[PDB]
Design an enzyme around this catalytic site. Sequence first.
Site, mmCIF file in Angstrom:
data_model
loop_
_atom_site.group_PDB
_atom_site.id
_atom_site.type_symbol
_atom_site.label_atom_id
_atom_site.label_comp_id
_atom_site.label_asym_id
_atom_site.label_seq_id
_atom_site.Cartn_x
_atom_site.Cartn_y
_atom_site.Cartn_z
ATOM 1 C CG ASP A 169 -1.904 1.109 1.294
ATOM 2 O OD1 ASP A 169 -2.719 1.380 2.201
ATOM 3 O OD2 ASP A 169 -2.149 1.675 -0.046
ATOM 4 N NE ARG A 173 -3.670 5.498 0.688
ATOM 5 C CZ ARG A 173 -3.826 5.197 -0.797
ATOM 6 N NH1 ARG A 173 -3.698 6.350 -1.529
ATOM 7 N NH2 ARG A 173 -3.856 3.869 -1.176
ATOM 8 C CG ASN A 174 -0.053 4.376 3.583
ATOM 9 O OD1 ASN A 174 -0.729 4.647 4.628
ATOM 10 N ND2 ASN A 174 -0.563 3.536 2.535
ATOM 11 C CG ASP A 187 1.141 -0.671 6.680
ATOM 12 O OD1 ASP A 187 0.074 -0.288 6.073
ATOM 13 O OD2 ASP A 187 1.236 -1.962 7.231
HETATM 14 C C1 LIG Z 1 6.090 19.974 13.671
HETATM 15 C C2 LIG Z 1 4.712 20.836 13.325
HETATM 16 C C3 LIG Z 1 3.601 20.528 14.138
HETATM 17 O O1 LIG Z 1 3.577 20.337 15.370
HETATM 18 N N1 LIG Z 1 2.127 21.079 13.576
HETATM 19 C C4 LIG Z 1 2.169 21.419 12.196
HETATM 20 C C5 LIG Z 1 1.148 20.789 14.518
HETATM 21 C C6 LIG Z 1 0.543 21.974 14.763
HETATM 22 C C7 LIG Z 1 -0.126 19.772 13.975
HETATM 23 O O2 LIG Z 1 -0.955 19.939 14.358
HETATM 24 N N2 LIG Z 1 0.691 18.499 13.267
HETATM 25 C C8 LIG Z 1 -0.229 17.902 12.478
HETATM 26 C C9 LIG Z 1 -1.027 16.929 13.110
HETATM 27 C C10 LIG Z 1 -1.550 15.762 12.232
HETATM 28 C C11 LIG Z 1 -0.673 14.467 12.285
HETATM 29 C C12 LIG Z 1 -0.241 13.513 12.714
HETATM 30 C C13 LIG Z 1 0.334 12.517 12.866
HETATM 31 C C14 LIG Z 1 1.804 12.578 13.233
HETATM 32 N N3 LIG Z 1 2.413 11.281 13.447
HETATM 33 C C15 LIG Z 1 1.936 9.938 13.264
HETATM 34 N N4 LIG Z 1 2.511 8.996 13.258
HETATM 35 C C16 LIG Z 1 2.355 7.738 12.953
HETATM 36 C C17 LIG Z 1 3.292 6.753 13.249
HETATM 37 C C18 LIG Z 1 2.873 5.308 13.281
HETATM 38 C C19 LIG Z 1 1.676 4.679 12.576
HETATM 39 C C20 LIG Z 1 1.416 3.767 12.370
HETATM 40 N N5 LIG Z 1 1.157 2.453 12.166
HETATM 41 C C21 LIG Z 1 0.731 5.786 12.168
HETATM 42 C C22 LIG Z 1 0.913 7.472 12.534
HETATM 43 N N6 LIG Z 1 0.557 9.827 12.275
HETATM 44 C C23 LIG Z 1 0.047 11.010 12.543
HETATM 45 N N7 LIG Z 1 -1.487 11.183 11.757
HETATM 46 C C24 LIG Z 1 -2.126 10.012 11.426
HETATM 47 C C25 LIG Z 1 -2.295 9.989 10.148
HETATM 48 C C26 LIG Z 1 -1.310 10.391 9.118
HETATM 49 C C27 LIG Z 1 7.299 20.821 13.400
HETATM 50 N N8 LIG Z 1 7.605 21.414 14.610
HETATM 51 C C28 LIG Z 1 7.902 20.571 16.098
HETATM 52 C C29 LIG Z 1 7.598 22.948 14.952
#
Ligand SMILES: */C(=C\C(=O)N(C)[C@@H](C)C(=O)NCCCC#Cc1cnc(Nc2ccc(C#N)cc2)nc1NCCC)CN(C)C
Length: 305
Positions: A169, A173-174, A187
């Site tokens: 996949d 998006r991933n 993933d």
């Molecule tokens: C950092 C910038 C910052 O902190 N932002 C822009 C803030 C305002 C913010 O809201 N960020 C966006 C949030 C949305 C998100 C997310 C996200 C982050 N990490 C994961 N990690 C992850 C790990 C493992 C699996 C598995 N299996 C899945 C996901 N996932 C997400 N969202 C999930 C769907 C994509 C820069 N700074 C510090 C100034």
Amino acid sequence: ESQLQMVQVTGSSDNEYFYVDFREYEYDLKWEFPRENLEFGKVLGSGAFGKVMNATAYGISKTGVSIQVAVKMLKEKADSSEREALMSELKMMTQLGSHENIVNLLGACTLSGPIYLIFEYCCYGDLLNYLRSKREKFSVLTFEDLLCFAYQVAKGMEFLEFKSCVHRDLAARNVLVTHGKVVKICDFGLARDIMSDSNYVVRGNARLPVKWMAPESLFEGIYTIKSDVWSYGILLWEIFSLGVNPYPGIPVDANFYKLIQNGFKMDQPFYATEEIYIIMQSCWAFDSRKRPSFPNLTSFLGCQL
Ligand SMILES: */C(=C\C(=O)N(C)[C@@H](C)C(=O)NCCCC#Cc1cnc(Nc2ccc(C#N)cc2)nc1NCCC)CN(C)C
């Protein structure tokens, strides 16, 4: 079930392999993390049977230094079968080893209650939504950033190939985004809203990312690292179109299957050079043997000058 899979090859042709199942292997207890040390923020993504949540993890990589993490867990409903799959996935990640361009495992919680898989936090979110948010602020996003993204993803896929893995996949998006504009291959399907997302097509037990799939995957259910090259090509079109849906305007139906089968290829996206587009087309070679390798692709992207 994880879309990231380790395989073992048992012959020279594409279909000669099988999937490695870690269900019978033992979990290395050195990855265990104290549950009481997880102060949960709130949800980052939600699938039908599981979710990834924000969390503050204290002491997980430096004592005295608390950092942010993403914790993959099962939904409130959690019958035994779902947990073993999360365990098998956990075991596989413990054996993969870390890499800069991979969302890495940091620890887990499995003993005194519900299963938590602790991964890196990627504060800029997924690469798809990231690129689409920079459609206005482009020349702030540059061409070199796009080229760097492409390079990092190809590096991550090279690491997975080296570790005898496949990613069934692979798509923008991933891919997640962190500090230094660093992207990491991820993933989540157990924690991915898989069918309010119209990019996945339901067919039996399968949830197929049809527009990203190689012909051999579409028609025969074969997933090799060369299938990933095809998917990588599609991902390239995503990057250099700033997040446009692949085959834009074309619906996923029986006609789409006929298009791919007859050798349909997407045109050059706006933000891509003729060179990069030539590479895309080579990824979309119908014969899997003619597609470039990830070592090839990773090396060539020293284009960043
Ligand atoms: C950092 C910038 C910052 O902190 N932002 C822009 C803030 C305002 C913010 O809201 N960020 C966006 C949030 C949305 C998100 C997310 C996200 C982050 N990490 C994961 N990690 C992850 C790990 C493992 C699996 C598995 N299996 C899945 C996901 N996932 C997400 N969202 C999930 C769907 C994509 C820069 N700074 C510090 C100034």
